[PDB]
Amino acid sequence: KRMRVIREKVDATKQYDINEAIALLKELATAKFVESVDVAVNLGIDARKSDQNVRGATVLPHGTGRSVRVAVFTQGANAEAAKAAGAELVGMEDLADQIKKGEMNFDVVIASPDAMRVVGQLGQVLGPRGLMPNPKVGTVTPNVAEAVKNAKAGQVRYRNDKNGIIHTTIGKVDFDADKLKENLEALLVALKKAKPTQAKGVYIKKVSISTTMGAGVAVD
Amino acid sequence: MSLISMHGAWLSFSDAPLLDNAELHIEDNERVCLVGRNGAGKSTLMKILNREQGLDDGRIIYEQDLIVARLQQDPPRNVEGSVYDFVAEGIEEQAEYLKRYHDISRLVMNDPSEKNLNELAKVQEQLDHHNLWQLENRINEVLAQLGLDPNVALSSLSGGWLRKAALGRALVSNPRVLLLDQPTNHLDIETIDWLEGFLKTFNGTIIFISHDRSFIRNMATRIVDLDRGKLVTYPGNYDQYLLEKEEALRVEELQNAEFDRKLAQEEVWIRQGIKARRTRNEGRVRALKAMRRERGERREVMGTAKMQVEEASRSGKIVFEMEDVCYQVNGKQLVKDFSAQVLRGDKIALIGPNGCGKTTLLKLMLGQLQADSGRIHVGTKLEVAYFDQHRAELDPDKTVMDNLAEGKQEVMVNGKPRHVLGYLQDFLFHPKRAMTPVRALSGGERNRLLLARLFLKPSNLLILDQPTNDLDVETLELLEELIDSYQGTVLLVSHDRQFVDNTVTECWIFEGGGKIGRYVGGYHDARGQQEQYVALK
Amino acid sequence: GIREKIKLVSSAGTGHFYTTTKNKRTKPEKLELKKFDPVVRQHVIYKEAK
RNA sequence: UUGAGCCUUGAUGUGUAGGAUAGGUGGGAGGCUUUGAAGUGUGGACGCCAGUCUGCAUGGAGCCGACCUUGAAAUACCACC
Ligand SMILES: Nc1ncnc2c1ncn2[C@@H]1O[C@H](COP(=O)(O)OP(=O)(O)OP(=O)(O)O)[C@@H](O)[C@H]1O
Numbered sequence: 001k002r003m004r005v006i007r008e009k010v011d012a013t014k015q016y017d018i019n020e021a022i023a024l025l026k027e028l029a030t031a032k033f034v035e036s037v038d039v040a041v042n043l044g045i046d047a048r049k050s051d052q053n054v055r056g057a058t059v060l061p062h063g064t065g066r067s068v069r070v071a072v073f074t075q076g077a078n079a080e081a082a083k084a085a086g087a088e089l090v091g092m093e094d095l096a097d098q099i100k101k102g103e104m105n106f107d108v109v110i111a112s113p114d115a116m117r118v119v120g121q122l123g124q125v126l127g128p129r130g131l132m133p134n135p136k137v138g139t140v141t142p143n144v145a146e147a148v149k150n151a152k153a154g155q156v157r158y159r160n161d162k163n164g165i166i167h168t169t170i171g172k173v174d175f176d177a178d179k180l181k182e183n184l185e186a187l188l189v190a191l192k193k194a195k196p197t198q199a200k201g202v203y204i205k206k207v208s209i210s211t212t213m214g215a216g217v218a219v220d
Numbered sequence: 221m222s223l224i225s226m227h228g229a230w231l232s233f234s235d236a237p238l239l240d241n242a243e244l245h246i247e248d249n250e251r252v253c254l255v256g257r258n259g260a261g262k263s264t265l266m267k268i269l270n271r272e273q274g275l276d277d278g279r280i281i282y283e284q285d286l287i288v289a290r291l292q293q294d295p296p297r298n299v300e301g302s303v304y305d306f307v308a309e310g311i312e313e314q315a316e317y318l319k320r321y322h323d324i325s326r327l328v329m330n331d332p333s334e335k336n337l338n339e340l341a342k343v344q345e346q347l348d349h350h351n352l353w354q355l356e357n358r359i360n361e362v363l364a365q366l367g368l369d370p371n372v373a374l375s376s377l378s379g380g381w382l383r384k385a386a387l388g389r390a391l392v393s394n395p396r397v398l399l400l401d402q403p404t405n406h407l408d409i410e411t412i413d414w415l416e417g418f419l420k421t422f423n424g425t426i427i428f429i430s431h432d433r434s435f436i437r438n439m440a441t442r443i444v445d446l447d448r449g450k451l452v453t454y455p456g457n458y459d460q461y462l463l464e465k466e467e468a469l470r471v472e473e474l475q476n477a478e479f480d481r482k483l484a485q486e487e488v489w490i491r492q493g494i495k496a497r498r499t500r501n502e503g504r505v506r507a508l509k510a511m512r513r514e515r516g517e518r519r520e521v522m523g524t525a526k527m528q529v530e531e532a533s534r535s536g537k538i539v540f541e542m543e544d545v546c547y548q549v550n551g552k553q554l555v556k557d558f559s560a561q562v563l564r565g566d567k568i569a570l571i572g573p574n575g576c577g578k579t580t581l582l583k584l585m586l587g588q589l590q591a592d593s594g595r596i597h598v599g600t601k602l603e604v605a606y607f608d609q610h611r612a613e614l615d616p617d618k619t620v621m622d623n624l625a626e627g628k629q630e631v632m633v634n635g636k637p638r639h640v641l642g643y644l645q646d647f648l649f650h651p652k653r654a655m656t657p658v659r660a661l662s663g664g665e666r667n668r669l670l671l672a673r674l675f676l677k678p679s680n681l682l683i684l685d686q687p688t689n690d691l692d693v694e695t696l697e698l699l700e701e702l703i704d705s706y707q708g709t710v711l712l713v714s715h716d717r718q719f720v721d722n723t724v725t726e727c728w729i730f731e732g733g734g735k736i737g738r739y740v741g742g743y744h745d746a747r748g749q750q751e752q753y754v755a756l757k
Numbered sequence: 758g759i760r761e762k763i764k765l766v767s768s769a770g771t772g773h774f775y776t777t778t779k780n781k782r783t784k785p786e787k788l789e790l791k792k793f794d795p796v797v798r799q800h801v802i803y804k805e806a807k
Numbered sequence: 808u809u810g811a812g813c814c815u816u817g818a819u820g821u822g823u824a825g826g827a828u829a830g831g832u833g834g835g836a837g838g839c840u841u842u843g844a845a846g847u848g849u850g851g852a853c854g855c856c857a858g859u860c861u862g863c864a865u866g867g868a869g870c871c872g873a874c875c876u877u878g879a880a881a882u883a884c885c886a887c888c
Pocket residue numbers: 233234238256257258259260261262263264265293660661662663664665690781782783784785
């Protein structure tokens with residue numbers, strides 16, 4: 001239906017510019033929804049090698065329209081002061097799964113950079129989606145305000161799909177059209193700043209802005 | 221567009237070259253089968269790819285990140301552990317990325333420094349592609365996929381189960397390259413039937429050596445020879461290879477005779493009279509010198525090893541009699557109230573599922589372990605020849621000559637003891653390689669050597685626990701004829717079908733709950749009566 | 758001429774090797790002899806190689 | 808009418824639990840659907856046979872995410888795929 005109408009409304013085979021798409025992409029927004037944006041950039045890397053795999057940390061002011069209440073794990077009292085300063089719960093190290101018996105892990109990683117009170121669940125269940133904080137993406141730091149500032153600064157993680165495509169929330173279409181261009185510039189240089197060592201040909205293969213139930217346009 | 225490459229390879233122990241200038245090509249998601257006669261070097265190629273030894277003059281180029289693990293052909297000797305222990309030791313290389321991540325949290329248990337912050341990149345450098353987080357919820361996972369329990373002492377399992385453990389320990393690492401040296405040896409039809417779907421679904425790439433002419437057909441994308449130092453591939457189904465290989469053997473036999481024809485008539489000419497004042501061109505004497513030198517070449521026919529048994533005086537008319545015998549292991553019953561007789565010249569095949577007591581049943585007959593009840597009476601003029609499942613009667617370090625005929629010269633052949641060490645030439649052992657320790661021999665070579673010294677002594681009785689595990693069909697064909705014509709008693713154990721339709725005339729089909737059903741005929745006849753059983757209501 | 762030449766590369770890291778012969782068809786085991794390493798000037802364990 | 812690459816347009820993806828043949832990462836909550844279903848059978852096709860895919864007209868507006876009982880959850884755009 002609407003998919004049959006909209007399939008003529010876009011011409012995704014073609015190529016466009018950083019600005020000739022903002023109005024071209026919002027035409028599909030007739031549907032009543034939250035419109036959870038699913039921007040898509042195709043990356044050029046030998047994805048099925050290990051060394052070229054990259055994971056990123058970022059900060060954005062616009063946010064995503066839905067913050068994450070992620071608990072912090074630290075052996076002892078790593079959650080007794082940061083729990084009230086940017087966490088839904090202060091996950092005690094001695095009770096690592098205690099505050100989250102049903103949900104053993106929170107939405108976000110646990111910031112106990114000085115505390116090694118647990119590797120975490122001892123069974124990898126705390127790594128179901130990669131929640132162990134590491135210095136490669138800077139998720140490990142004893143300063144709770146670093147993770148506490150995550151809520152006030154909107155920390156977003158990157159993903160290396162088995163083909164090599166990064167997906168992130170943008171600050172869903174609800175917001176303006178210039179902030180999308182600001183958002184792209186943030187993720188552009190900061191991901192260019194995040195580029196690993198090995199590369200071939202171009203680096204950023206393709207760029208597109210889309211949604212789970214929203215059509216896209218090849219930004220370029 | 222390529223996975224493992226080998227160019228200009230060379231491998232030659234202090235002997236003729238195992239590997240000449242040879243090449244290999246491994247693609248994505250292919251099941252390649254290696255088919256070569258016994259002692260030809262299929263296992264040593266597997267050790268080359270697995271980064272284990274050799275390749276003096278050549279280059280191996282396989283990509284990094286390519287995890288390779290293999291399954292050996294002979295059962296291990298670290299048997300005194302436990303199943304979970306033996307299976308676990310297959311992640312030895314993965315045990316380092318696993319252990320550092322928990323270890324170097326101690327450096328970050330203090331203040332975050334460059335040496336402690338930069339570490340999380342290093343230990344998790346490998347982690348992105350691998351799983352590495354659940355190397356206890358995967359090892360225990362595979363058993364629920366396989367069937368073994370994790371905490372049973374592994375020095376106890378049967379030959380079929382011990383082989384299963386070695387197929388798991390080579391698969392915990394989840395390798396991209398699976399090298400299966402003789403996968404189906406002590407398995408039953410059910411295990412083989414299930415394994416034919418496990419490997420087909422398997423995502424990576426499989427290289428395997430199998431002597432099963434029925435397992436190969438179901439799973440072989442490409443087939444590889446490795447005949448006499450050179451390996452060549454072949455297209456089509458399995459039966460194509462047999463046809464194309466025979467042409468390669470016939471033509472090579474055809475050209476081999478022609479070369480001898482020239483050299484034959486070039487030696488009548490070397491010793492001919494000169495005549496009057498002629499010279500005898502040295503452009504032909506030097507060529508003959510090059511022909512005689514070229515005769516140090518490969519013998520195209522390996523030699524169809526010849527064998528013969530040593531019949532002895534007739535045994536008593538009753539070989540084994542056991543009634544009311546009921547032996548049961550702790551948990552389940554293996555034999556429950558048996559009552560059977562074995563007469564002279566009766567050929568019996570023990571068949572059944574894995575670990576159902578076939579090997580232990582023979583142990584009761586020879587009195588290795590004592591029956592719980594019922595009593596067993598043994599024959600009166602028996603000369604037992606025993607072929608264990610695991611060979612176990614040859615020390616791997618003792619020399620080939622001494623293990624054959626128990627460290628003595630003067631074998632007895634046919635009529636009278638007028639033979640010594642020529643008994644190897646009947647089995648295609650070169651007399652030069654007679655001091656080789658037995659551990660150096662290939663699996664099939666070791667199978668024949670144990671077979672050789674059983675047919676070396678007088679015997680009225682044969683017990684064979686899978687005598688044809690590693691033998692090729694050419695050598696297996698002779699064993700079918702030898703055992704058939706054998707006058708004395710024969711109790712043999714085998715998991716294949718074609719072999720028991722030509723040697724045996726009865727079966728003892730195993731059932732659960734310690735019950736043994738004795739049927740009449742070869743394998744297929746006995747299974748035929750087992751469909752039509754009505755069990756005496 | 759059965760015997761084949763081999764070399765014993767040092768385990769002390771310093772690129773160094775003695776060379777010798779070995780009857781490979783009667784000695785499947787690999788030699789491991791303790792011998793001088795003049796680069797490090799200590800007695801280390803020399804293991805077989807190409 | 809034939810053999811390789813593209814560009815989409817169409818379908819393919821069973822270790823098991825289990826709703827059932829269940830591809831990664833999605834990010835979500837609710838969409839679809841009425842240009843008219845659950846259905847009726849149809850026809851090539853599929854089987855690793857328990858099904859999942861669409862023509863063909865009669866009828867044609869009711870089914871799904873939801874709790875999870877899992878390694879990873881919902882045939883619910885499109886991203887080189
Ligand atoms: N370490 C060694 N030292 C010397 N000779 C060896 C060594 N390993 C194997 N050989 C010999 O070289 C050949 C290689 O044996 P290998 O085990 O590779 O045979 P195979 O083709 O796998 O045999 P099978 O078909 O019986 O399984 C054999 O003739 C063997 O006797």
